[PDB]
Structures are given as structure tokens and as C-alpha cells.
Amino acid sequence: VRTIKVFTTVDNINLHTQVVDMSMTYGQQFGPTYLDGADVTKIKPHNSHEGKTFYVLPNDDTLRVEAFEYYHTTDPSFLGRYMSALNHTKKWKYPQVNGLTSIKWADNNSYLATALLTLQQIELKFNPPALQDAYYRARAGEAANFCALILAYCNKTVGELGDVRETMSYLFQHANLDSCKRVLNVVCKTCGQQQTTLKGVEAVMYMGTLSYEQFKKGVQIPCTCGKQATKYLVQQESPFVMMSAPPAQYELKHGTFTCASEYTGNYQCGHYKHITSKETLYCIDGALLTKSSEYKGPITDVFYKENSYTTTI
């Protein structure tokens, strides 16, 4: 028998000594086995594998519990989807642009670069240790793992056309936004006045307008009575808000927002860029950087800082 030694893991924290037969495939002995993203199930051990760390699909209770504790999912496809993504994201370039980890354009990743840039500018704690650890590494310039995890958590494959607002919504659902509270008042001439409290993701995301100020003053929405009613923001408790609308020409003013998603072209197959408010306006286009004191262009998301807001109405 001819047998190198390896470590198996689901989380790359808890490592298990295995001694593998070199005649038999990884698949025969562990089930689905991966190396640095690369599916090696049907391959047999090369000598240069000695003492390396393979990811395996959980196949005992120990590994299922470890996988849930690390990823916060029992989805048996999760590991394979994560590894398939990582196989690409480890080949992407992550240049520092204006002090932020960006992504050089590849594999339709403009939406992922825009999300990654945004996440470095808002306050968020991820529930899954996998996401938290990778977010810290990405902020320090090593974003491959974080990008692979984002794809796996959003049910996206490399090359798939992604929406930044949907991606942020999925990420927010994996974050601690419990303290986040939104109180709305709705005013109809007929049904009258109704207040509702939103919590978590629904407290920090709105679709319909880019302007936080315009949200505070009120926006026109349909009432169930059939009339148009006024929805306005009573109370906001969150470290940020995300205001989205279908793309449209919008003016961004230095110092009045944190950052924004620019989107150019047709539904689904357009291109995102990222606008950030520093000492002036920076436009991050993957590896490309431009700056200007003023900006007008097609915006679909705007992010703003918050802590505690109460209306004067």
C-alpha cells in the first residue's frame, strides 16, 4: 500500500489527518474532494499532495456540524458552488483603488466589484464566520475567498449577470441587522394614517427613490382604498440606508452620500461602476479610477450614513 498523508476539512480550521491510498481516487475514499477550488474527486494522489489541506463534502455528523457552524447552511451543493466560484475568483486581480480593494474586470464581475467596494464603506457584521473572516481578508486586499462566498451565498455562478441591490439584500440577510428599525407613517385622505415598524433588511433597503431626503419628506404610493397615499420616514435606527430605483439620470453631490451604483445599458446585460464621496467624487470602474468635483449619470443605488433619525412632523 502506497499512502501520502493529507488534512480534510469543511471550514479550513478543524483539520483531520487522513492517510490516502495512491491507487484510489480522492472520490473513492472521501467523496467529493477539492483543492484550492479545483475539483480533484476523480483524480488520485500525486506525491506533491503530502500534508496539503483538501475540502471534503461533509459525510459524518462532526463535519455537518462544523460546516453549519462555519457557513450557516446545510445546503449540500454549497461547498461545490463555493469551490467552482473560487477556481475563478483566485485568478482575478484585486487592485487597491483610492484605498479600497476593487476587482479588475473579468467574467461579468462589475456587480461583484461594486458590492465589494460598497461593503468596505458601510458598517456590517456577518453572522457566518466564513463570511466575517473572508470580509476581513478582503478589506486587507485578499478578496478571492470573499468573492467566491458572495457568489455561493447569492446562488450565482461566475459569468452570471448579477444585480447589486439583490446581492446586497442577500448579504444583509446574512448580517446582524436586528437592532435596525424603520418606522413609516402612511397618510391617505380616506383610510387615514397608519404607522408600521420594519426590522432587519427591510429597515435598511427601500426601492422607489434614490433620495434619503425625499423619503423623509414623503413619497406618493398606492393605497389599498384605491387612492394615492404619502409614505414618509418617522424613525430610522441603522448605521446606513440603501435607497434604490430603476436607473435614471441623477446628480451626486460631494459630501451628501457615502457611495452609489452607476448602471449603464440594457436591463440585465449592462455595466456597473461605483461612485464614492471622499474629498472629491471618485468613479471606480474595476481597476480604472476617474475623479470629478461634480457628477450626473445613471444611478440605481445610493448608500447614506445613519445612526438615529426622528422626523419633525
Ligand X SMILES: Cc1ccc(/C=N\O)cc1C(=O)N[C@H](C)c1cccc2ccccc12
Nearer to ligand X, 268 or 308 (CB): 268
CB 260 within 8 A of CB 302: yes
**Closest distance to Zn ion from the beta carbon of 174 (Å):** 6
Residue nearest to ligand X (CB): 246
- Provide the grid cell at 19: 492517510
The one segment of 126-134, 159-167, 234-242, 259-267 that binds Cl ion by CB under 5 A: 126-134
Distances (CA, A) of 38 to 34, 96, 213, 239: 5, 27, 48, 39
Choosing from 127, 195, 256, 310, the residue that interacts with Zn ion (CB under 5 A) is: 127
- Provide the grid cell at 217: 419628506
Which among Zn ion, ligand X, Cl ion, none contacts residue 69 (Cβ within 5 to 8 A by kind)?
none
**If binding is defined by CB under 5 A, does position 220 make contact with Zn ion?**
no
Identify residues 223-262 at the interface with ligand X (CB under 6 A). 246-247
Choosing from 82, 126, 250, 263, the residue that interacts with ligand X (CB under 6 A) is: 263
In terms of phi and psi (left: phi > 0; alpha: psi -120 to 50; beta: otherwise), the region of 118 is alpha
CB 116 within 8 A of CB 143: yes
Give the distance from CA 95 to its chain's centroid: 18
- Provide the grid cell at 177: 441587522
**Closest distance to ligand X from the beta carbon of 115 (Å):** 12
Which residues in this chain contact Cl ion in the complex, by CB under 5 A?
9-11, 14, 66, 72, 127, 174
Which residues in this chain contact ligand X in the complex, by CB under 6 A?
161-163, 246-247, 263, 267-268, 270, 300
